[PDB]
Swiss-Prot record, chain A:
Subunit and interaction comment: Component of the large ribosomal subunit.
Cross-link (Glycyl lysine isopeptide (Lys-Gly) (interchain with G-Cter in SUMO2)): 123
Residues modified to N6-acetyllysine: 78, 84
Keyword Acetylation found: yes
UniProt function note: Component of the large ribosomal subunit. The ribosome is a large ribonucleoprotein complex responsible for the synthesis of proteins in the cell.
Locations listed in the record: Cytoplasm
GO molecular function, one term: structural constituent of ribosome
N6-succinyllysine modified-residue sites: 84
First-to-last residue of the parent protein present: 2 to 139 of 218
The protein, known as: Large ribosomal subunit protein eL14
Curated annotation (Swiss-Prot), chain B:
Organism listed in the record: Oryctolagus cuniculus (Rabbit)
Name of this chain's protein: Large ribosomal subunit protein eL33
Subcellular location as annotated: Cytoplasm
Family membership: Belongs to the eukaryotic ribosomal protein eL33 family.
Residues with the N6-succinyllysine modification: 62
GO BP annotations, alphabetical order: translation
Cellular component, GO annotation: cytosolic large ribosomal subunit; synapse
Swiss-Prot record, chain C:
Cell wall biogenesis/degradation is among the record's keywords: no
InterPro entries with a match to the protein in the record: Ribosomal_uL6-like, Ribosomal_uL6-like_a/b-dom_sf, Ribosomal_uL6_a/b-dom, Ribosomal_uL6_CS2
The gene coding this protein: RPL9
Family: Belongs to the universal ribosomal protein uL6 family.
Described function: Component of the large ribosomal subunit. The ribosome is a large ribonucleoprotein complex responsible for the synthesis of proteins in the cell.
Subcellular location: Cytoplasm
Protein's UniProt name: Large ribosomal subunit protein uL6
N6-acetyllysine: modified positions: 121
Keyword list, A-Z: Acetylation, Cytoplasm, Ribonucleoprotein, Ribosomal protein
Main location as per UniProt: cytoplasm
Assembly: Component of the large ribosomal subunit.
Length: 138, 109, 190, 251, 199, 176
RNA sequence: GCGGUGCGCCGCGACCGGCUCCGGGACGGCUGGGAAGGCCCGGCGGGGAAGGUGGCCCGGGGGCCCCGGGUGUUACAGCCCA
RNA sequence: UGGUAAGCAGAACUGGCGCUGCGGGAUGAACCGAACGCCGGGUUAAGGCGCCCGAUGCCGACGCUCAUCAGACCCCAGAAAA
RNA sequence: GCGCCGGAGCCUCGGUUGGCCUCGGAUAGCCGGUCCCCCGCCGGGGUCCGGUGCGGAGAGCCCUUCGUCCCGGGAAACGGGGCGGCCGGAAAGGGGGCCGCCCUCUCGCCCGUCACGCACCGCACGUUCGUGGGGAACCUGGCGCUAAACCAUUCGUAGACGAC
């Protein structure tokens, strides 16, 4: 049933720590609970990093288990993980999560005025979809 | 209009175990649960609002029964967003687990 | 330590359709449907190949006492297929010295009378497990035949009618009387 | 140091609050558990200890030394005049216990059943169940009565029937009847409640509840003896006469 | 402002620790489905741990002795009680705020009940380690109304299913009132999405 | 020595000081794994006094410098020879580790000799740390990671950050 | 007006100084005059094995697509040295 | 040193208790830290930081261990051979 | 002289400062849609299709409130507002959702017009839940209720005395 596997050259999303919110590639498995991880196009240095901080994504790209930072950089831009990330719903709702937490008090007003009206239009329409059910069985 | 203060709880005094110092309060501000988020509230004014039997004057108002002991959020307490406050009169232990109002208006933003 | 991976494939034949909702398996074939729930075991039951011609049970990062839980699911499901194709038949012969252990089945197999065990005027009425039915078969004077799909129930209900006829407050080495599981086989022969 | 010679313990502690029974009429703590395949029946009755006499019967037990031989057995005659069902009370099944859902009394409650609702019957204006009576003889009242039997066949699981003793038919001094919830243990809760409403304001003789040669359970309060010493109450060993401060006590 | 916590699948002390702390901070907590609480360690250990509790009774008058409460609501209430200064007034004013129930009664059956993930068996026990249901524990050591609670708990699950099915029905309508009505909510929607509420 | 934090490898060279009998005695180099240079210069004498007629008073430390990693990115296999005190007798042990860094694979030995054997750092004497090519590794806990196409999932992802809401309204997902 | 002196009570602010606890910036020294790494192209040449890439074989999974053995040193991946 | 040993009896050296509060060891004359005018702020010791109870509500690190009698912090308050 | 429904004010106890109206549950797995098919009175079962670091997200949702005019544009007309039917609810029964009028406006909600309301002159307990709980009596209108308990007396199934 497991879909994502700690595989040699899996793109993994770092959740917390120094390099939080960055895609690192699993270069080699060091230990039972740590891996050598590099992200040259995402500005993560070739370094050891535990599996507890990284949420491993659904991208695997072919380089050998000992390949130096240049041969990771080739496979990162050959596949083009920077653009293929930001079109994933997960990536789109990290940067949507960023936006709501960066919302100004003036921006918070303009959204409240939008949400109020945007809800009033649907609440009128669902109530009309509600009468469209009651009207069939009579 | 609307609310101009944040919900804090008088969660006891600054105390070891077998000694309490009643001069400093320990405030639990709702929402902040780390030392990273308690930095906004340092220097802010904190009010313990209660009311008694007798009427007392109200500044810019007619005499209510409502009273205050005004204070000040002096510094952060512990590792989990608890904060130290120091009131002009030492808060009564009646107030333990009751609402005090950490204000906004020693504002730095 | 933690072994990175331990797996063991069950070569399930053409005759059997095994399918699995979660780590619960359902196994059906020529003679009925067997369902066992392996919620207690904490493994990955994969079912791979076209026609699903084998089961694959993975255990990732397992200590010594968790790699023991791979071959148990293998053997349990293998006996969940033998019961589904060939069934299970535990022929058990009634040993006595003097008194004939007089066995006849009420409730068309689901209850076993045991009369005249060591001249006991008490009569023992052993209710069989749901699915299994005993039968005093022919061509052997003292002979009980249980038949059923579940290896568990045919064997459990055999050990009910074995532990029913125990010799109390005597030397059990001299008094070898009772009904004992003489042959573990299958209902129909491969 | 130990009990030199071992002896069993004087009395049981399985009743040990040895106090005046706060009820004079004995409560049925536990009625029998029902199976809804039985016919509908009252599970209990309420009598009066009349007296005591001999009996002679030819004992029909094989094996005994008194097989087909006549014995003298002591018997208690309990005068059990037929009881009047005057109400039904439904019990809903709750996780905190077994809550009384709703009581429904009858229209005509007997004048002796009224006396139980009074400490002083002489002084009272006797207005008990005079407003509840009017629920039956108004068109809007029968409805909310019928919405209870609708509710109490639905929500309730334990249906008990209020059946008082008819005190007029006894040589006793008292006129104040004894109310008692008797659990109707029978079929479904619907059938159980249709049956008790049929028995409402009606006689129930003992033949309806009990039959001949039946093993039953007699519940009641003991013959009161007042303040009794430990030699009388607990039946302990008396002390050997030379004792200074009393011989009729626990040493 | 009432924490209606779910008791199902939570650990007995882990939840009691967090309940006892909130309640001292002037919070009114309701812990519900207390039979659903389970204690770490296999069943026979935890039963023996509670059987030993039954034996600790006052020799000269057990009526004075430790009141061994059997119901899972009052086994959970007791373990919270031990984590409070219940001899003082603020620890007695504490227990007045806490309100503990078996199954889920009427006020709370039609209320979204919270979960403490820090006090949760799936989170806090290794899945290989055995645990003991407080529902089974209470029953076998003198609690009477397991089967009575279980049916009323089942009579609301089938009742609360009909709510959820009728909520999925409104939520199908709501999304189908967005495919239909997208042309005239767009200028309103496309400022929600610039502030990251919908993407 | 308290085996505190991550250990650093030190090249501590020291000579028995000039005499009339021996003006220029032979220099003695050692691989000392220490939290800092002060206790590297302490543990230098501990091992040198055990081997040579040389206390700190009748000697000097000529160069106590930290030796860094010559391949801190290459994941390597380290064979450490131990000499630890049990509660009864002392034991020679060959133990394998798998770290980027020599000095952290030695740290990973100090946490493990504590974990398994309750051996506090003063009991332990690291005598030899050798990088081993992946055939010369007998202990199978390291040999399971000698795999070109190594592939394991992260099976039961127990969540931390259990207190950030503390009162969520959903049972936490653990399959990822 | 200035200077002294205070407020009936409740308060607020300002800057200066003392002592404090943290945050942000920026500069420099040293080492094996850091170790590794990035970037030019694994520059030209030679070598070695492996947790063995392609090649080929083996065994079988798919409508030609891919996994699991073997062979052996760069090919349609890389890795450590001279 | 005597004694099987003793919260036993008898010495040497230093420090305690007595005469002495305080923080910690839940609680203890002596243990550990530190000795005391009355106070405000700061910071520590020895101990701690699920809750009682101030403080881990660190996305702490790597292991060990399942007990039908778990284990859990100097003095110290229950164990051995096997 | 008390129970139901229908202003003016004095005491007293103080805590609060918007709501969440609900699947069951899994965890080595989930959530949400569909008919060629199937047993069930429109429920379950799949099959397929999407989602899954939960976005049909509690990291969420709902309500968001200086007041009003004048005049516009989208938006609503299946709307808002309150008087008599129908239409819900036991584990500790609740304030709902609807189909019908007698009905009052085309106002409420989102952008822009046009001016205005102690603009109380930098300042604190403001803003709420709240006609909150409790305690007395006062003006009062309909609609309504006319009891017991204890002593005493008596009994003796009871009893030191109370109690029963």
């Amino acid at each position: 049933v497991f879909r994502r596997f700690v595989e040699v050259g899996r793109v993994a999303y770092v959740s917390f720590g120094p390099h939080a919110g960055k895609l690192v590639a699993i270069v080699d498995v060091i230990d039972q609970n740590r891996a050598l991880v590099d992200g040259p196009c995402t500005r993560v240095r070739r370094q050891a990093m535990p599996f507890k901080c990284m949420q491993l994504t659904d991208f695997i790209l072919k380089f050998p288990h000992s390949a130096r930072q240049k041969y990771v950089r080739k496979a990162w831009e050959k596949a083009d993980i920077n653009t293929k990330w930001a079109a994933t719903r997960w990536a789109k709702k990290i940067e949507a999560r960023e936006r709501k937490a960066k919302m100004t008090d003036f921006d918070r007003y303009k959204v409240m005025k939008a949400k109020k009206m945007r809800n009033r239009i649907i609440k009128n329409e669902v109530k009309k979809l509600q009468r469209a059910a009651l009207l069939k069985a009579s | 209009s609307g609310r101009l203060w944040c919900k804090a709880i008088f969660a006891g005094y600054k105390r070891g175990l077998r000694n309490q110092r009643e001069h400093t309060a320990l405030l639990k501000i709702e929402g902040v649960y780390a030392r990273d988020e308690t930095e906004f509230y340092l220097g802010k004014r904190c009010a313990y609002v209660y009311k008694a039997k007798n009427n007392t004057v109200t500044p810019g108002g007619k005499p209510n029964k409502t009273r205050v002991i005004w204070g000040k959020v002096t510094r952060a307490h512990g590792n989990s967003g608890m904060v130290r406050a120091k009131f002009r009169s030492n808060l009564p232990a009646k107030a333990i687990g009751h609402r005090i109002r950490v204000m906004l208006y020693p504002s730095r933003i | 330590m933690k072994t990175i991976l331990s797996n063991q494939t069950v070569d399930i034949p053409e005759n059997v359709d095994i399918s699995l909702k979660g780590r619960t398996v359902i196994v059906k074939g020529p003679r009925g449907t067997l369902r066992r729930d392996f919620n207690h075991i904490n493994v990955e039951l994969s079912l791979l190949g076209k026609k699903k011609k084998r089961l694959r049970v993975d255990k990732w990062w397992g200590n010594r006492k968790e790699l023991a839980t791979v071959r148990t699911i293998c053997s349990h499901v293998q006996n969940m297929i033998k019961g589904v194709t060939l069934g299970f038949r535990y022929k058990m012969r009634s040993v006595y010295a003097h008194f004939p252990i007089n066995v006849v089945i009420q409730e068309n197999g689901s209850l076993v009378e045991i009369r005249n065990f060591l001249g006991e005027k008490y009569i023992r009425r052993v209710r069989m497990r749901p699915g299994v039915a005993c039968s005093v078969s022919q061509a052997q004077k003292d002979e009980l035949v249980l038949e059923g799909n579940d290896i568990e129930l045919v064997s459990n209900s055999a050990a009910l009618i074995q532990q029913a006829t125990t010799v109390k407050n005597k030397d059990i080495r001299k008094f070898l009387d009772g009904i004992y599981v003489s042959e573990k086989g299958t209902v129909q022969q491969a | 140091s130990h009990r030199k010679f071992s002896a069993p313990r004087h009395g049981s502690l399985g009743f040990l609050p040895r106090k005046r029974s706060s009820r004079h009429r004995g409560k049925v703590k536990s009625f029998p558990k029902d199976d809804p395949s039985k016919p509908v029946h009252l599970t209990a009755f309420l009598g009066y200890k009349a007296g005591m006499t001999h009996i002679v019967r030819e004992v029909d037990r094989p094996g005994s030394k008194v097989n087909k031989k006549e014995v003298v057995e002591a018997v208690t005659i309990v005068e059990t005049p037929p009881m009047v069902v005057v109400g039904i009370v439904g019990y809903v099944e709750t996780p905190r216990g077994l809550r009384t859902f709703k009581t429904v009394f009858a229209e005509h409650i007997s004048d002796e059943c009224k006396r139980r609702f009074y400490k002083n019957w002489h002084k009272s204006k006797k207005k008990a169940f005079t407003k509840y009576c009017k629920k039956w003889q108004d068109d809007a009242g029968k409805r909310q009565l019928d919405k209870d039997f609708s509710s109490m066949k639905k929500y309730c699981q334990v249906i008990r029937v209020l059946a008082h003793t008819q005190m007029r038919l006894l040589p006793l001094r008292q006129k104040k009847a004894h109310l008692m919830e008797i659990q109707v243990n029978g079929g479904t809760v619907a059938e159980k409640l249709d049956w008790a409403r049929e028995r409402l304001e009606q006689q129930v003789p003992v033949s309806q509840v009990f039959g001949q040669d039946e093993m039953i359970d007699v519940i009641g309060v003991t013959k009161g003896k007042g303040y009794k010493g430990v030699t009388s109450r607990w039946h302990t060993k008396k002390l050997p006469r030379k004792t200074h401060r009393g011989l009729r006590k626990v040493a | 402002q009432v924490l209606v916590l779910d008791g199902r699948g939570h650990l007995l002390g882990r939840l009691a620790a967090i309940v006892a702390k909130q309640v001292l901070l002037g919070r009114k907590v309701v812990v519900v489905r207390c039979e659903g609480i389970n204690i770490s360690g296999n069943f026979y250990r935890n039963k023996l741990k509670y059987l030993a509790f039954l034996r600790k009774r006052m020799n000269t008058n057990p009526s004075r002795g430790p009141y061994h409460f059997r119901a899972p609501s009052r086994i959970f209430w007791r373990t919270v009680r031990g984590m409070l200064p219940h001899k003082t007034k603020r620890g007695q004013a504490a227990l007045d705020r806490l309100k503990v129930f078996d199954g889920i009664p009427p006020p709370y059956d039609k209320k979204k009940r919270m979960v403490v993930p820090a006090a949760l068996k799936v989170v806090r026990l290794k899945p290989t380690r055995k645990f003991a249901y407080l529902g089974r524990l209470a029953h076998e050591v003198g609690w009477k109304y397991q089967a009575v609670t279980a049916t009323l708990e089942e009579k609301r699950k089938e009742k609360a299913k009909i709510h959820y099915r009728k909520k999925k029905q409104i939520m199908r309508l709501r999304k189908q009132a967005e495919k239909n009505v997208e042309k005239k909510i767009s200028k309103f929607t496309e400022v929600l999405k610039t502030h990251g509420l919908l993407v | 020595t308290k085996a505190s934090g991550t250990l650093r490898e030190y090249k501590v060279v020291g000579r028995c000081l000039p005499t009339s009998k021996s003006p220029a005695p032979p220099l003695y180099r050692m691989r000392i794994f220490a939290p800092n240079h002060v206790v590297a210069k302490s543990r230098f004498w501990y091992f040198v006094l055990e081997l040579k007629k040389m206390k700190k008073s009748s000697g000097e430390i000529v160069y106590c410098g930290q030796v860094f990693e010559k391949s801190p990115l290459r994941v390597k296999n380290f064979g450490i020879w131990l000499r630890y005190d049990s509660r009864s007798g002392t034991h020679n042990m060959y133990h394998e580790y798998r770290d980027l860094i020599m000095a952290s694979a030695v740290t990973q030995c100090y946490r493990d000799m504590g974990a398994r054997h309750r051996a506090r750092a003063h009991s332990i004497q690291v005598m030899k740390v050798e990088e081993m090519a992946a055939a010369r590794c007998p202990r199978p806990a390291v040999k399971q990671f000698h795999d070109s196409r190594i592939r394991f999932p992260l099976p039961h992802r127990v969540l931390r950050r259990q207190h950030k809401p503390r009162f969520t309204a959903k049972r936490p997902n653990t399959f990822f």
